[PDB]
Amino acid sequence: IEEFPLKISGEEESLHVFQYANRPRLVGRKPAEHPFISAARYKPKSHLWEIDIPLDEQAFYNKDKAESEWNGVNVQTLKGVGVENNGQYAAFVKDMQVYLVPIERVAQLKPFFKYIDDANVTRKQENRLTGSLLAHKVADEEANIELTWAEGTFEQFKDTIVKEAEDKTLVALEKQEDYIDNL
Amino acid sequence: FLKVKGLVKQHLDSFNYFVDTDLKKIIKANQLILSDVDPEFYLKYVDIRVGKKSSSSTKDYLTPPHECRLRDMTYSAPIYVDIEYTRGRNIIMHKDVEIGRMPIMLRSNKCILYDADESKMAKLNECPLDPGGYFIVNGTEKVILVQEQLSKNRIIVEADEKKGIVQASVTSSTHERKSKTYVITKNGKIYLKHNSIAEEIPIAIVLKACGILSDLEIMQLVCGNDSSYQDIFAVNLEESSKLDIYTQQQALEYIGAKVKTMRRQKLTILQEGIEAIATTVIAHLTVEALDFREKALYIAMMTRRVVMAMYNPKMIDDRDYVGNKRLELAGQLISLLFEDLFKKFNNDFKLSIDKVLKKPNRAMEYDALLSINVHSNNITSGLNRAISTGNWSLKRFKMERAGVTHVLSRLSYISALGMMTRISSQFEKSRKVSGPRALQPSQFGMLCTADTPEGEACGLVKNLALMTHITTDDEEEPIKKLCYVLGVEDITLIDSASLHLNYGVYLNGTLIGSIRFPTKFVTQFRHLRRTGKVSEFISIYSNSHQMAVHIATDGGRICRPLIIVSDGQSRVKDIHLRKLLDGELDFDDFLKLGLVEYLDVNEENDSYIALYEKDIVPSMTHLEIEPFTILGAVAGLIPYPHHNQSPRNTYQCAMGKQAIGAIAYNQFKRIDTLLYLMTYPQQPMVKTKTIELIDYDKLPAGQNATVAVMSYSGYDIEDALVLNKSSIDRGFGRCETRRKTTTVLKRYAN
Amino acid sequence: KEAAAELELLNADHQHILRKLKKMNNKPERFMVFQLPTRLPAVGSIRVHKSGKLSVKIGNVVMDIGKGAETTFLQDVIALSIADDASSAELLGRVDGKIVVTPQI
Amino acid sequence: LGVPRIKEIINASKVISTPIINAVLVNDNDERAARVVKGRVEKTLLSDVAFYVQDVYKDNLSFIQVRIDLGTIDKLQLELTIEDIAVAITRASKLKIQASDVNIIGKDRIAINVFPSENDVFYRMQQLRRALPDVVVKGLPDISRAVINIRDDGKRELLVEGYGLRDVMCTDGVIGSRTTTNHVLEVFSVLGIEAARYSIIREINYTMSNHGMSVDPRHIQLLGDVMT
Amino acid sequence: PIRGFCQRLKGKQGRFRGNLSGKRVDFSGRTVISPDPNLSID
Amino acid sequence: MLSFCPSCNNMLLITSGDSGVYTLACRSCPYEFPIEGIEIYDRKKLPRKEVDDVL
Amino acid sequence: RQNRRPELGDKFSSRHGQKGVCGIIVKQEDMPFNDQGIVPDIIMNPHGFPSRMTVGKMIELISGKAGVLNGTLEYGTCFGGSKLEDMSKILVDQGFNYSGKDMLYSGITGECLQAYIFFGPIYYQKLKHMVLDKMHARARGPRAVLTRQP
Amino acid sequence: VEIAYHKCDELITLFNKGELETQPGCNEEQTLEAKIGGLLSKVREEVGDVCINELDNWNAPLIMATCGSKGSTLNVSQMVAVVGQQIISGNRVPDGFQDRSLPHFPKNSKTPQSKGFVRNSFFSGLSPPEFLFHAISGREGLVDTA
RNA sequence: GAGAGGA
DNA sequence: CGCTCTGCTCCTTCTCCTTTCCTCT
DNA sequence: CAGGAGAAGGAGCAGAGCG
């Protein structure tokens, strides 16, 4: 009976969503775990993400073969492709109401074995081209614009909340049946 | 239903849809011809029409079908295309020129007999009761028989226990490529054979190459959480590390190394291998992006089906199941033939243009449209010859089919009507295989359960029933958006762990996503279909053995109308029948008002159908309009067929075509090779509700003999009869045989 | 059978998501992801009814009665942003669950 | 028993579908005798008397442990011991790769040790673990199943689906003078050519009599003589 | 489809099975059959 | 073995490490496991069914 | 054009799979006749029924006789059609037996047939397999050029 | 037929909710199929014998079966009384759908009149599912010959 | 040549 | 005492058959 | 287009003898 409103804000350019296919939620009642993250590489016009998570060497690192077969690798590389999916909105609660924001991009990150490729290419060294191949060409022609990280924020929340229902946008010429017909 | 959608409607509707859509589709496909020299010279096919010179305002004059039949000509209409040819002064000019003559199917949107009523037909020497749907080529009535085939782009898994081998082949069929991607099981190890790769590639490697490289999401996409499946699939998960550990690029390189496909231009082995996954592996799905999750999950579902078959047989699907088969009519075959002929014509025209323009100087462009009229004989000659001889020679697919067209049978009226609406099995002989020749219960209402050439095609050749409508490709893109609105998460937003915890909705064979509450989704989609939001032929159903909500939209599915019943009671409500009998609600407002709906073979799995209104328990969701529509046009001849033994009904269906009698109203204005006629045909005493609809009481083949069932004279021991003289004298069984003899006074070259 | 179990599961998801919305009123870093039909019918309110029934509206009067997406887990999902190709990719936090809405009849 | 059976006898095929070995027991007045003999002539896999299989590593070695449950052995009254199972595994390791050492720790817990190059131990041990609970421990490794059937007048005999006629005749608990299979070539191999002729004639006569047709036996005898 | 001597000999319609062991014979007819009880057997 | 390593999720492999010590780890990962003897059992409980006794 | 007469040996079907050949053509007076003088056009043997179970044909005969006596065309349709009880009522109203079995007089001895005879109109259709097109005989004539065989 | 249907229905519910005593050779489902097939054969034989004994003198099918001129007592029993079981390939009709024979029966239904039983004689007239099952058997025979 | 009865 | 032929035995991949004809067209 | 059955080469081990 009690009204529980929600309002959609502006686009605020594009905010993406990362999904770690490998990292699960905690088996306990407190799934507040998040690995240390740094060295994020983005790639536009092909929608590529590369997230690097360093690993602690005091627990199950195998210091010998890591440098014997590869270089000084201590961080697994999570690569992902940002797929577009309309209708996906992220919601957060500031007051009794709910604030929504478009997502327009979701990426599932999976481990990438860059060191294996590097080792193979080092060991080996001693015309439309249409279709997805062309896209792959871009993916390995120019890429890897560097980017930083930031843990915790408030300016995004403030810029999403300053809408304060100034443009309620309640005007709607259609009705239930019209919307059903024009899905 | 038969007034709005006649018995011969597969051929008519398919040909009309062809001439209305596929002509322009092929035109826009091959809309441009280029050259290495003279970059400012191109031909643009703006528009194409059949029998319509420019505006005209009137269909061009066609030779009447009977005149074509008598003169041994070919019934056809001209094809007029638009022309855009440039000039050295860079001036674009337009023209409308004939490009050939396409044969016209009788009683189609192009034939003159379209909407002719008992006076135009009489003036054109055409029988009003003639079925139509057949071509007149070289003065011969040739009909393109409906071809049945396995469903394209669908998974068919057969467990060959004879060796312990199971498989997951898919005959993906595109407009250009058609290839089978089998997923066999050898040495307890799942593979993936192909006609373009070398030998038995392990499944783990192809799954890594398709994007799912985690090596644990494989176990969550092929086994879910069943312990009895993981141990079965654990055997082949270690082949991605036994040879050596793999990454996505390494797996692509490995699959491309053994690719047998040749490259006409130099491409890297990894580059080719990506192609081998991009398009070559599954022609059905082309992943022209940076994410291959759809193809990877498709292969994962194929492997899941294979593992399900491995753990316990009897979970496979029968190939002979009617819902697994599609029917291709004359329209699609003619579309293929015309596309091949048109591409050959364009290649020849471009070669001739390059040859003429090769001269360095004075390369005139005036009268550039001479070679097109020179070659316009080639297209029509090839079309007529391919239709007449029945040998459909194609090169794009390297497909050769023989006996597609049959000479229309003229013995009785029912023979000519039953040759139409006939289905030919794709199997050549099926010597001892008693599978495709059996009577599958799934064809109830879809195929005539009594009419079948007895003998050596006894089970291969089948005939359509009365209540039966063949589907056509409605849509594919809008339904994805409709599903996403309906509340299924996309395929790129569901983790592999929870992918097998709830029903996943498959749209036309390819996984789209997973949606909770499958019953609500199915009910809402069916309501949307009934209220008219989507096409009536889009069939959605639920499979529970593998949790799925399948949606089928492609044409060729066999559908029949059924009365929708709500909780406990029907929806006709006894007042819509009154309006139907009055003259309104011509079975189309019945679909618009959601009283009846088309069920195909697969959607009947989810339904509970009542034979009669008095049997409706408050759980059934459909009602039979009438149970006597399970028999075709021929089988409607039998009186009280539900009392006879089934082989008797089959023999009657076989021998009713070869019963002499009235053939057509113009049977005396007709010169055919061999006509049998009855002097005094008589309407049957014991009629049938079917024979009124097919007009068998207006052109009967038989007489009401006063039979006395009695052993008499001894000359009637084994099936022999005792005809009564003094009745033969008065005229009883009197018949006539008409035979034509043709003579051509050819003019020799001398 | 199927309908009754579906209704019970829908009621359970309604009460569970109401509890989740009440619980995540604190806003340290948590989000939630909504799926909506496209074309933007044109906001409204997620009006809760008696006996734990939840429904939404838009500027047009339309009661999209669809609540409760997959309870999928063991896939750590977090949300980030992009700011004009400059120093960007600010971690906006993780999401608790997912909601999918659907127009009804 | 239709046309395909006559075709199989006529063509003298080396393999036929559903070959049935009728074996008559020496003592068939009690089911206790009828089941102790049956267990000797069945493909009794390890899986039915393994009760679990595990793969256990150590600091520098690894092995496979399977504890045979004596309860099922006693309830199935099989005549075999731990040493019998071990020697059966070693002898049937023809299908497997290699097996030379078997140990017993207590209450029949057989351990098979695999010791050797990178990943060879792990892959070999995994394959051995997968292929361990299917080695025929007791019986004849050419038999799908065997069922005790009760004849009229109280007699009973065992019907076997397989190709082990010589072994079935040899094993104790049955009378070898009366034990016959459907397969003609098997009878030819194990009992001379005259027995093959007798089997051909008798099987053709039985097939054409079960179908109710009246063909004189002399034509069948002529056919058998022509074949043999 | 060249008809090699092997094609001319082998097959169901080859010389051995179409012309040597079973030929077409003269002084033969083929017609429909009807009963005739008044006609004696033989 | 049928075990998967965190941060790699590939299948676990037993390798003859230094001095012939069987170490459990995954390729393509900076991960190992000093072996405790793996006394955690990979036991497969074979689905034996009911049996009947006459003797 | 060629006008053909139903010669002996022509194939007639019965719309129930009871295909047969014209065994004999007998004169009208050498035929059974009822009280009204009707002689049958076709005398089908009764042995075609007991092993082929064409009860639909018997029901067709009764329905046809009742309809023609009532001056209407009866319906034999799958799962329905004119019920047998109504047709038998019509048949007994006109003075005929309820089962359609009249009592005939032998046409050659002129006495009653000691069993009532199933008698009525059945829709018989003449098939195209006529003996005139199938009779074929050879003594000498054309021989194959290759093997010198007929 | 009602008694046989009642017995088959109680056997079906016993197989569903609980378990039935499996025959020494087959499994549970095959035991159920064999038991219901035997029961249907017995009831058909009994009603056929009743019909044959109740058939009067001077009956044309009866005479043609007694003298052996055409047919037998089974044919006249099917024409008059009942044509019980339409066995195809040595067993009852297979499943033409998911856990069903026809869409006119409940899912997972094994009772007679739903898996190839024709309680209607040819004189009475076949019900649509019975007609389809008989057509399946007839086409099986026709294909078998060729 | 190949399309189909037919027994 | 390993080494090196023979020899045997699988194992795989290959080849030759599927009524009668009896018509028409 | 399926089904059945042989003949012919690789290929992997026992077995024998040996300098």
Ligand SMILES: CCC[C@@H](C)[C@H]1CC[C@H]2[C@@H]3[C@H](O)C[C@@H]4C[C@H](O)CC[C@]4(C)[C@H]3C[C@H](O)[C@]12C
């Ligand atoms: C796994 C493959 C099974 C099958 C191909 C093999 C495995 C065992 C073989 C039989 C036995 O050798 C005993 C007999 C020997 C005689 O000489 C010829 C017949 C005989 C029955 C054999 C036939 C055939 O050769 C069998 C069935």
Ligand SMILES: CCC[C@@H](C)[C@H]1CC[C@H]2[C@@H]3[C@H](O)C[C@@H]4C[C@H](O)CC[C@]4(C)[C@H]3C[C@H](O)[C@]12C
């Ligand atoms: C995050 C804390 C680190 C530590 C507690 C975690 C991280 C990696 C985990 C091991 C691996 O998963 C591989 C094995 C899987 C088997 O199922 C159980 C044993 C096994 C050795 C695990 C034990 C334990 O669970 C480990 C050591």
Ligand SMILES: [Zn+2]
């Ligand atoms: Zn690892």
